[PDB]
């Protein structure tokens, strides 16, 4: 057996954190079109039998809390876990409407030792965010 067991009762969760509007203090502009994403994703993962859940404009505190809570649920009947983040960011950092949070912190709630119901199961994290300011000119 060299592929993940995907025949559990349910495919698993799909948390889509969609941050559009940021507090004046962050110095970030509204992310137009992000709703086209969150909508497009929702449908896509629904067709793959994932239980989808959308969240809009959550603060960095809310994001952490949400993760801590989802990682406390029992995933024994779930084949996998998918978490899509759409927001602003820098290298290793994503933005809550009111500020920055490093990925490490919200990812840790899911390691083999902290979230046992998902141990040995594929935990996917899709991230649409900037990782710095470098621009890629291209070639050819």
């Amino acid at each position: 057996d060299n592929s993940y067991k995907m025949d559990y009762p349910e495919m698993g969760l799909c948390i889509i954190i969609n941050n559009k509007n940021f507090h004046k203090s962050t110095g970030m502009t509204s992310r137009s079109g992000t709703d086209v994403d969150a909508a497009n994703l929702r449908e896509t993962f629904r067709n793959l039998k994932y239980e989808v859940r959308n969240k809009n404009d959550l603060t960095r505190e809310e994001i952490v809390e949400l993760m801590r809570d989802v990682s406390k649920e029992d995933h024994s009947k779930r084949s996998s876990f998918v978490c899509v983040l759409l927001s602003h960011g820098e290298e290793g950092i994503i933005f809550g409407t009111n500020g920055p949070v490093d990925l490490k912190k919200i990812t840790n709630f899911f390691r083999g030792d902290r979230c046992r119901s998902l141990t040995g199961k594929p935990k996917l994290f899709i991230i649409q965010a900037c990782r710095g300011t470098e621009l890629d000119c291209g070639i050819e």
Partner: protein
Amino acid sequence: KIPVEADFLYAYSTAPGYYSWRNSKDGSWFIQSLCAMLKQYADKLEFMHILTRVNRKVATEFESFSFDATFHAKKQIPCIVSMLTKELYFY
């Protein structure tokens, strides 16, 4: 016994240190591409190969247009960070 950091897959929209492009009416390049590929290959290709298609699409069919030379004609390449132990199929 397995590593705690194992079985994680981080699919980034762009390479380390770089900017990530979003279209005001169509959504980000990465997300619209990721969803298109899933729609066509979720029932045929293993996940890593699907993200590779996403990678080619973003790098091939997208470029920024701006009146500001600074942000004009810019390119993007997604970044697959896998720590998966096995092959992944959605079927």
